[PDB]
Amino acid sequence: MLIVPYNLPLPGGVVPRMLITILGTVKPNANRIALDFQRGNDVAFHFNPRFNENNRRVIVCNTKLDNNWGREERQSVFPFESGKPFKIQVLVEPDHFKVAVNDAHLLQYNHRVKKLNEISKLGISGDIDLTSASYTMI
């Protein structure tokens, strides 16, 4: 078990066939989770489950450039449950991040930040107990 917020270094950034696995349990009164794939201060890929946005559950994805949030991509398919263990897998492909939760495909997010080899940190934060965060080459 790790202390959140947690920074996972991604040395030399990400590359196609890099599979990032995040294992954790959602806290019982969860409001939000965030994965932030960072290129310095920019967020190439913000993955943000929201448990209570207007009494709905939604996943918000976005990019932050020069400290400005861009256009949101939203997904109502919401595989997280308060109190339950999850696995998030982010598979880097040539043109998008592919996200599967609990071995079920969830969403794709097209690369807005092009410099994948400079996306050198993943921030993990929010209402989770973090069990592990790691990556491998498939």
Position among 28, 68, 71, 114 found at the interface with Cl ion (CB under 5 A): 114
Category of 126 on φ-ψ map: left (φ > 0), alpha (ψ -120 to 50) or beta: left
- Stretch touching ligand 57I by CB under 6 A, among 4-12, 18-26, 48-56, 99-107: 48-56
Residue 69 or 134: the one with the smaller Cβ distance to ligand 57I is: 69
Position among 7, 17, 29, 69 found at the interface with ligand 57I (CB under 6 A): 69
Position among 2, 19, 23, 60 found at the interface with ligand 57I (CB under 6 A): 60
Residues 6+ apart with CB under 8 A from 1: 129, 130, 131
- Stretch touching Cl ion by CB under 5 A, among 22-30, 45-53, 82-90, 109-117: 109-117
Site for ligand 57I contains 72 (CB under 6 A): yes
How far, in Å, CA of 15 to CA of 119, rounded? 10
CA dihedral 117, 73, 6, 83 (to 10 degrees): -140
Site for ligand 57I contains 32 (CB under 6 A): yes
Residues that bind ligand 57I (CB under 6 A): 32, 46, 48, 50, 53, 60, 62, 69, 72
